[PDB]
Every structure is written in C-alpha cells, then in structure tokens.
Amino acid sequence: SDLELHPPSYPWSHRGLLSSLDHTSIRRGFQVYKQVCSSCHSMDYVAYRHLVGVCYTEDEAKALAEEVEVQDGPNEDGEMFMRPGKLSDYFPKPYPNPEAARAANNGALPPDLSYIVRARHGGEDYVFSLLTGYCEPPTGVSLREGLYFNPYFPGQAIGMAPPIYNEVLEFDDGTPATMSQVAKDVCTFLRWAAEPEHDHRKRMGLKMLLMMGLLLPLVYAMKRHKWSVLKSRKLAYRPPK
C-alpha cells in the first residue's frame, strides 16, 4: 500500500513490432545467468537443447551441459548417482525446494526466472530499472537488517542484495562488462527465456500483414462485384390510373 514509481520505456532493439531479438546479447545474457544468477534463481522450464541454433552450436551447447553434474538413475543396484549433464537436462535447480531457499536467503524466495519478464508489469523495462536502480534510502526510511532499498520494488524493501556490478564477469567477445551492459544482456536473454517464439512470431506477423493487404481488397472486390447488380438497380412504380 505504498507509493509506486513505474519504470520508463527503454529502446530495446526488439521493441518494434517487426524487430527481432539481438542474439549476441542473448548469448552474453546466458553467461550472466550462469555465473551470477543461477546460484540463487532457478529456471525450471529451460533445457540446454533450447540453446541449440539460437545462440550456441550443438557442440557448444553439449560442452556447456557437461560442465555441471546432475542426478540420474536408478542403476541395476537401485542406487541414485551423478553424471554430467546432457542436452536433454533442464538447468540445475539451486535448491531442492523453496523452504531451503528461504533459509539460504534470509527468509526470501528467489523466484524461478523462466517467465519473470511476463509475470511482472513492465517486463525487461522493470527488470532493467530494478537491477540498475539501487540507491541509498531517502531520509526517514530505516530498513531492518537483511533487507535492501530499491525504489522500483513494491514497498521499496527487497530481500535481494544488488546482484550485479562492474566486472562481475568477463564476456567471451571482449565487450566491456559494465553494469548497464550486464543489465541489457541479461534482460534480452530473459525475454528469450520467457518468449522463445518471439522472432518466429514476428516473421509470421509480417507474412500475415502482407497477405491481408492483398486478400482484403480482393475479397472486398468480389463482394462489390456481386453486389453491384443491386447497388445500381433502379426502381419505378407504375400503378394503373
């Protein structure tokens, strides 16, 4: 029941109606999630195979899956065991359940991020503004220990410490890992995570507009063609006198 400040609209390169995602920024954004976010945030609905042909090759994505160990089994003795990930595995969860998560994060629950952009008003505008929007509390607000001031979060008191900062990681293509850079890349990746169909739907949308621009006047012309018999008909009344 506090005052709200809504995020402005940043000019993402995928904002326009026909504008695709930038897949190099996705690639960088996955690197942010893996190294920084995945230790607190799950992504229960994304698997390594989804990366293939979007931002990594099959060989690259396979090598990426094998960099972590996942549980499998039972074997012939009835025991569970660990093996390296394969393309079919979903991204490892950091905690077995949310109760462990609250205990590891001063009682707060980092939500799953698979859909985070779609489950909050403002999408990447909100997330970009949140990550890059931390500041000292205004005069008269004193937050309990464990909590951090962030003016874009409802109530302005969030249980997540600022998770990104200059040089948290180095990008593979040499791009300077500035806070704003890291925010932009991770936000583009999170859009893709929530809406992998983004680019394909816009390509279809273009084809739908072009076909409609053809079919609407042609079907209109067929309507007018048949109806012209009636629209130009003339009547006369000739009663006997």
Binding site: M211, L214, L215, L218, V219, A221, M222, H225
Partner: peptide
Amino acid sequence: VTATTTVGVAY
C-alpha cells in the same frame, strides 16, 4: 480477381 484470391487462401 477470384483466381488470385483462392491462391492466397490456398497458401
């Protein structure tokens, strides 16, 4: 007009 219409519906 009709032929090109059914083309688009066909596509």
